[PDB]
Design a binder for this molecule. Sequence first.
Ligand SMILES: C=C(C)CCOP(=O)(O)OP(=O)(O)O
Ligand SMILES: C=C(C)CCOP(=O)(O)OP(=O)(O)O
Ligand SMILES: CC(C)=CCSP(=O)(O)OP(=O)(O)O
Ligand SMILES: [Mg+2]
Ligand SMILES: [Mg+2]
Ligand SMILES: [Mg+2]
Ligand SMILES: [Mg+2]
Lengths: 295, 279, 259, 259
Amino acid sequence: MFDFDGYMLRKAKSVNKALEAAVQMKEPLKIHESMRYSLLAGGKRVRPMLCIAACELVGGDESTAMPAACAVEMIHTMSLMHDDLPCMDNDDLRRGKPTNHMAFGESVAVLAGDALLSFAFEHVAAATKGAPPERIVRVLGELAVSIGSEGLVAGQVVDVCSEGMAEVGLDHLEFIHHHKTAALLQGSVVLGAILGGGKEEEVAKLRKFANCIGLLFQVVDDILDVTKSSKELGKTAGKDLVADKTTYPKLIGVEKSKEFADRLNREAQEQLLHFHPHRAAPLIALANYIAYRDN
Amino acid sequence: MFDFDGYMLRKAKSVNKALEAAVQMKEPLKIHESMRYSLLAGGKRVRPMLCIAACELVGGDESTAMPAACAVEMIHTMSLMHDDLPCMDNDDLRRGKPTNHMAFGESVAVLAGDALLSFAFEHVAAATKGAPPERIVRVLGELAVSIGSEGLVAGQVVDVCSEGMAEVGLDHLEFIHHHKTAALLQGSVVLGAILGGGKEEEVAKLRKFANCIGLLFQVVDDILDVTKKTTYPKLIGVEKSKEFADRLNREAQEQLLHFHPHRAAPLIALANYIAYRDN
Amino acid sequence: MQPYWAAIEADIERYLKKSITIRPPETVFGPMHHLTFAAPATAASTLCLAACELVGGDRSQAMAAAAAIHLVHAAAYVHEHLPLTDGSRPVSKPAIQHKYGPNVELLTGDGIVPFGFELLAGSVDPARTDDPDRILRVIIEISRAGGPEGMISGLHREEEIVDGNTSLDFIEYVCKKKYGEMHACGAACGAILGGAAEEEIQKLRNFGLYQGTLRGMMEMKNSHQLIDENIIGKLKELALEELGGFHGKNAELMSSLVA
Amino acid sequence: MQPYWAAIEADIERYLKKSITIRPPETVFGPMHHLTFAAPATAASTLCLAACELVGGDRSQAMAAAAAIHLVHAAAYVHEHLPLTDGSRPVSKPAIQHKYGPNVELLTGDGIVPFGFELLAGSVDPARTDDPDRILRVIIEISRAGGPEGMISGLHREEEIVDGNTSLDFIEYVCKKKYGEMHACGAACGAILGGAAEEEIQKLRNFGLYQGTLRGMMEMKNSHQLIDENIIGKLKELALEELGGFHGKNAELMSSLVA
Ligand SMILES: C=C(C)CCOP(=O)(O)OP(=O)(O)O
Ligand SMILES: C=C(C)CCOP(=O)(O)OP(=O)(O)O
Ligand SMILES: CC(C)=CCSP(=O)(O)OP(=O)(O)O
Ligand SMILES: [Mg+2]
Ligand SMILES: [Mg+2]
Ligand SMILES: [Mg+2]
Ligand SMILES: [Mg+2]
């Protein structure tokens, strides 16, 4: 039997403890305080857990993947800090507290965000131990590609340039969700699998798996946005409706979105048949968590 | 000697470059900005020169003595930053420019002054190369003794503790001048002599040289204010103040008699300069 | 601008144009391309190619690093001129022109920085042995120079500058953090990728540090008219010293950057 | 955990009173004695003696350092409670009483700090061959900890704390700077003076660092009602973990402050 609540509990604890050690208070104080305010506030740490679990699945250990795991959470964090700003979604709550720019000003929120992004690269490059240099370099490139113009940033810019697009298509919406959300999730699964010593074939199967849950994470985000309150979600919820935004609860409605999430999950766990079921248990569990979480 | 001014200017240039490099702007920026504001404002750098000259006099080199030369200027600098303070002499200017606490506030001026004092020690202890450990520790010892309760600070307290009873005798006035001025000059020349490898006898003659020129300076300064409360002219008259200045200069120079004439020349030249200067 | 430097800069421009080709989604790659070339050219970048030559290697070994340096600098420039509603950054007179709105600029900046790391991780040529260890080292230098204790510290403190009553000392420190560290990073990386040894790397690092600071002061010279020739000579002197020990053709070239 | 710690404070005191004799001019030494003992003792000095004994040294071998650390603390204490005319330093509600005037407190503070270094240089026993190097090292440690990047940074940033509007991260940082640096310093010095090896020293240094941050963290607890049980618990683990490699009572008595 696999106790998923127990597993995530201790993986998240381990991750939160390393995030705190990696990003200490030091001069300039306000920049670092702002970095820690949003990073250590309190996310589910799905991305760093996926990175560690994929590393473990292929043979490696947590310690080798912890820096990359922390790095994906740093980049994920600054992407929410930047997403919340007035020129972007202009929100007032994130991770249960006022949004970064409300607490430090827009200037500091932008810069603190930029610091987390650069530091994620510094940190995986200099803190990773137990991997050949050529393997670290490779990981740095997968990370870079998963968050730039063919990844996270593209989905995010296409999202704000298609926020009034009344002529929405499944193809267009798929582009946004895959890039804006699935790309960083793929990257987290991929960095772990490569740092774990995985063979090309296992990496490719995990990339596909990650692609599914990646897309699934955004469908579920879109659904929560309309069925959960801001207090519950820890962030401003309900503004995706009032906006001409592109989501699934839009094109097919909540229910048809739910069924869709189910298939995605199903399809993701199917890619996992590549591995022995005892070993796949954690990723199978993270997959369900992504499907059935409440926030 | 030929070109005493050029010699002082070359020494101040080297010292200025080393000060600039030792106290860089860094976080917390206000503290460091305040330290450099007063440290790098320029001046004759007589203390650093005394240290270097004393080191070279006994065969040592300027390189070994520079951290120490910089440390004595660091102390001198914070003694003035603290002295200009409102609770102290409450000065708004110095050399024409706003005083430190006017530029950065009293809190920073106090802290920045404290930072120069501890950094002086740090710098001498950590940056001195070319000298054995017990010698650097000895030198740290002479610096503390020259600026503490039996040196600079003593002169600073007693001086501020004497602006109430204008009935001060020669002994009292000499105490203050010796402490407030000669102690730190004595410290400079002792740091350099020791670091340079000077025997104890050489070291003792340099201590005497500095105490004489230290007092020489305040005496000449009083004669000048007159030929332009207590002073040498009000205690013994200008005639006697001048005789005293001359005796101070002669004794100072007497201390340098047995060193290399060529290495002694700059110190001999500085004694004559302090004694005959017009302002 | 000197012909040698201008020519090196042109090569970086070409290498960047070939690396970033406008394609769909144009909404993404258009601003990516435009904002890369909209940012000022930075010597931290040409200094990387040059540093590499000076120590022996060939410039092409440092091209990806030079492009990554310009890109990191470009995202920072875009973000520092970003229109902020809340008036969080003292409205600097600059008021530069903007082709895209704040959101597209912000995001594009976030996209530019990883592209720099992407080029670096991809310039990994098989027919290269010590490739991986040096690139990895260069990623560290670059991610550090563009990190919280590097350029970002300079951008943050710059907001405290009041044209009115702020010392030359404080301005020099901002230029050191904002420009000096990146320049130091560029000369160091060039040296690293060329194949130099620690001693040379530090010398070239230090030279970059001073030159970059000097350059920053020049740019801010046309703003806060107070830059005594003393500050510049100081920095100029400080730089050249670090080069004292490099002889040849490039030696005078590198020397010409500050002189 | 009770009489041991007490006796240490007594021995340090007995040693200071022996070293600071009120004498002529009482105008200098009266304030010097008063202010040195009017300053609340600091655990950084205690820690200094305890670490020396922990690694095997004799208590006297670290007495000079312990007294120098107290003196550095006493001077900072005096200076941070100076009545300032310009209201630059935040109005400290807990107003220490003043037996002497501002001018006298300020100068006395300047005379106490060097007395610490005097005691240290003056504690070199010419008959003990390891004396010079260890004391030299300690002078560097103490001068750094009480300098611009140590205690003074904490004292400076402390003035930015708004009694009911500053995060725990910023407060913790002010405490690591104001108290942690010095505690780390004392333990590190006690270890050095005791003959400990590098590994032992770093461990005790680390321990002191957390220990002092934790202690100062409380000096303010009764002020900034926000002290989450999490901070004091995170610092305790970091501290108590650094002791991994030192077992026993005194090797687990240091942990009698993390109670
Ligand atoms: C769905 C997207 C693209 C972003 C929000 O992600 P999370 O739901 O992972 O929120 P956190 O737990 O990290 O705070
Ligand atoms: C010349 C002697 C013996 C003492 C005074 O030095 P200064 O205090 O005059 O040095 P400056 O700072 O004015 O340049
Ligand atoms: C992927 C990034 C950078 C931000 C969030 S996408 P979103 O605004 O649709 O989601 P949020 O409600 O803000 O979490
Ligand atoms: Mg958004
Ligand atoms: Mg949003
Ligand atoms: Mg005075
Ligand atoms: Mg005065």
